Structure 1
Amino acid sequence: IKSALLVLEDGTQFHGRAIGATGSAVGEVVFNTSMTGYQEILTDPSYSRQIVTLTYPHIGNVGTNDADEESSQVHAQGLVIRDLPLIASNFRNTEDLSSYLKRHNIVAIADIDTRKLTRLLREKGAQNGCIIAGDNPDAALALEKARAFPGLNGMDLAKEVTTAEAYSWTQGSWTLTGGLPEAKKEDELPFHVVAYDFGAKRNILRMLVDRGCRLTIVPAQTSAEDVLKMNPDGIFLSNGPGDPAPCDYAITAIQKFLETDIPVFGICLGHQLLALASGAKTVKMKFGHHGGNHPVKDVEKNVVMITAQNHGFAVDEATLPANLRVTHKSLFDGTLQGIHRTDKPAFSFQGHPEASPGPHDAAPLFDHFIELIEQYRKT
């Protein structure tokens, strides 16, 4: 018997079993509806400081593998599941989930009523919590730490996971047949994009490369100036954890790029940033969007796409500046999903066009970005 316990801010306790590292974990608790893709999710930087709950009971069926890692590490503060399978059964598995968790030093709990947990969060909105896994998990203590959690509202997490120094990425997407490909040679990539790293998912980068982009990853706080100097064919604003709001540096910089003619594309946190820099307002959602079955309509074409979502904050549609047209909305709650500058070559998407995990439906969002780029070069 290896105990584990999860306590929410409200005092609600979930007793189960430890499946990861011994220790404690504190974070905002969220639920994810993805039936597949647990590894990619765990390795998503956007999950920093967040305790991840998966609705699909059986988590770990396929094991783990390096190819399924969205970042260099596990960003999830903790993992909450219903059942940890006896075995992993997939030709691609290189290590079982439990082993993997331990190795990444993640506090994880299994065997809890995840459903009850999910309905609670939906009903009452996000909550902060704490998981304690050890010999004698102290409930009171757990409550203490949860309660003491600062909260993600107003928390700038982007500066926390961003890269120390700039770097170049030239690697493309995985194939069943060829796995993860060998990094391309610079002369092979037509365009050169500059990517702000606000805790970037490797699949975004890879898919950009697939489109003929050679990247230059830059720290979050990099100055527009320093950037402009590079002569970018395009600028990209990545996804990331925390409140987009407090990231003044980025906002400021973006504003600077907006005065130029250089194409700009932001995904998720980068969508929020763009919006902010355009004079819009962001809010913290009740429980947010985390899953991969989210319908999003391209209001323009009147077509729906099933998308991969992962956000706790959104852009207020009602405060949008006139230079900011709406391009996409959620079919689930009507929330703002995409926007494009009426006057500039800048646009963004709240969801994850790069999926990973998730439906490939929204991939073409990248395509538009390329267009902008190719046309920017024409000029």
Structure 2
Amino acid sequence: IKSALLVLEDGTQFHGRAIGATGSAVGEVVFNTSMTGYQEILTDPSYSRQIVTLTYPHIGNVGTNDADEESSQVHAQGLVIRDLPLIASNFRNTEDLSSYLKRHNIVAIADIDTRKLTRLLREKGAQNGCIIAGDNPDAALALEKARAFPGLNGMDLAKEVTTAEAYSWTQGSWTLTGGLPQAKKEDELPFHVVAYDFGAKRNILRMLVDRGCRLTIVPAQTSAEDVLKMNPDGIFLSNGPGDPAPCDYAITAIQKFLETDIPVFGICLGHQLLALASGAKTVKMKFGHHGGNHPVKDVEKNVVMITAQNHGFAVDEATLPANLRVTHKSLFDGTLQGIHRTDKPAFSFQGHPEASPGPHDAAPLFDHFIELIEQYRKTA
């Protein structure tokens, strides 16, 4: 008997068992439908301050491994599951899930009616909650903590996870045969790109490098003046947690780039800022998009792609400026997923083209950027 408890703002109780660190966890509770990629899910910075619920009952079946880490740490505040398997069984495993959880100090709860919870959040929308893992968790206390939580609306979390200093990135993508490759020599990669670190995922970088791009990761608050001084062949805006609204420096820096002919490409939060910096407005979804079976139409080509999604905010297309075209849309709810600049060489995707985890369906989006960039150096 190793108790755990989940209490939401509405004071909904979920009694189960502890499977991770001992203590307390607080954040916005979300549900994710991905049947695969839970480690990647947990190491995604975008999960900052939110307590992740996995709809797929068996979580941890393949254990864990390093190559499957999206960031340096476990960004989720918590983890709620239906069932932790007795064992991990996969040749890639290096450590079971409970173990890993403890190692990262993650409070985690299992054996709870994750469906009922999913249905609540669906119908009722995003709730704040708290997990209390311990000997005699106090309901009333967790509830109190649940309610005390400020909430993600209006919360700049990107500054909370960005890098302190700028680093170079030259590492390609993993392979079954070779695992994670050795970073390249800058003498190897042809294009140079700046990447604002709003809480970036390794996969983006890797996929970028795969394309022949030498990256320069900068902190979230870097000035445009400063960036422009690097003579970028392109500028990349990363994914990240919290509200994108509150990130004044970004919009600024972005607006500043737009003034220019350099190609901008944003993903998830990067997409939101690009919108914000273009005149657009952002909104906070009732429940958001968390899963890897999300259908997104390319209005232009009338094509459909299965995508990986992780957002609790979106851009209003009603708020779109005539200089910002609509390129992608969600077939699940009609929500906006891509926009391009009529005037500029800037584009952005709400979904995760780098996936990890999920369908490789949206990958060609990086192809546009490179195009832009090749073009820039032709003319430039």
Post-superposition CA distance 1:268-300 (Å, at most 9, x none): 000000000000000000000000000000000
Name the CA distance, whole Å, in 1 between partners of 2:74 and 2:239: 16
Residues 169-196 of structure 1: CA deviation (Å, up to 9, x unaligned): 0000000000000001101000000000
Aligned to 2:234: 234
How far apart are 1:42 and its partner, in Å? 0.2
Per-residue deviation at 1:64? 0.1
Q: Deviations over 1:129-168 (max 9, x none)?
A: 0000000000000000000000000000000000000010
Q: CA deviation at 1:98?
A: 0.2
Stretches of 4+ moved more than 3 A in 1? none
* Partner SS for 1:317: coil
Shift of 1:34: 0.1
Q: CA deviation at 1:228?
A: 0.1
> CA separation in 1, counterparts of 2:286 and 2:60?
29
Q: Distance in 2 between matches of 1:277 and 1:321?
A: 11
Q: Distance in 2 between matches of 1:377 and 1:79?
A: 46
* Deviation at residue 39 of structure 1 after TM alignment: 0.2
How far does residue 99 in structure 1 lie from its aligned partner after superposition?
Answer: 0.1
Cross-structure match for 1:18: 18
Task: Render the CA deviation track for 1:81-119: whole Å, top value 9, x for unaligned.
Answer: 000000000000000000000000000000000000000
Identity among equivalent positions (%) equals: 100
Q: Distance in 1 between matches of 2:146 and 2:340?
A: 39
Extract unaligned runs of 5+ from structure 1: none
1:18-69 per-residue CA deviation (whole Å, 9 max, x = no partner) reads 0000000000000000000000000000000000000000000000000000
For residues 281 and 336 of structure 1, what CA distance do their matches in structure 2 show?
Answer: 12
Distance 1:256 1:365 in 2: 23
Q: Which runs of 5+ in 2 are unaligned?
A: none
Alignment partner, residue 361 of structure 2: 361
TM-score, normalised with respect to structure 2: 1.00
SS at match of 2:159: helix
RMSD of aligned C-alpha atoms? Answer: 0.2
CA drift of 1:259 comes to 0.3
Query: C-alpha displacement at 1:245, in angstroms?
Result: 0.2
Q: Secondary structure at the match of 1:370?
A: helix
Shift of 1:319: 0.7
Which residues of 2 match residues 76-91 of structure 1 at below 5 A? 76-91=76-91
Residue pairs, 1:218-229, within 5 angstroms: 218-229=218-229
Count of residues in correspondence between the two structures: 379
SS in 1 for 2:252: helix
For 1:210 and 1:124, locate their aligned partners in 2 and report how far apart those are by CA, in whole Å.
Answer: 42
Aligned to 1:305, the other structure's residue is in SS state: strand
